[PDB]
Design a protein around this ligand. Sequence first.
Ligand code: HEM
Length: 106
Amino acid sequence: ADLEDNMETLNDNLKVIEKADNAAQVKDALTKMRAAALDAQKATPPKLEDKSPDSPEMKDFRHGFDILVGQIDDALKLANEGKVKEAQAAAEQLKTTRNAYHQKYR
Ligand code: HEM
């Protein structure tokens, strides 16, 4: 999928997690976010199109998805342990990462 479509998928699932009633809904949503983040990681964002693919900026852009995947893994862990509300609260941290990386590259 392209970068924009993967961003919509992340947004779609963040909202599902916020309104979720059970662990399956939260687990499934985090699972789809993780796959979209990994798909997005291979893209070149518009703002960095004139930089080399291996530049410090492109490496930082890719690192933003490694942070996001780590945060999703932490929330997935809690949801799998039946700590649903804790997983939903943990998922809010993804917004900090979104905000910091959007600030830089969106
Ligand atoms: C849960 C985390 C995130 C959410 C919910 C999110 C959501 C979005 C949304 C809704 C858009 C608008 C475009 C569209 O999808 O139609 C967007 C754009 C974008 N996001 Fe994210 N994002 C997240 C994390 C990140 C991270 C971590 C990065 C960088 C590592 C990033 C980089 C970008 C870029 C570069 C654009 C602009 C793409 C373009 O103009 O084609 N996003 N994001």
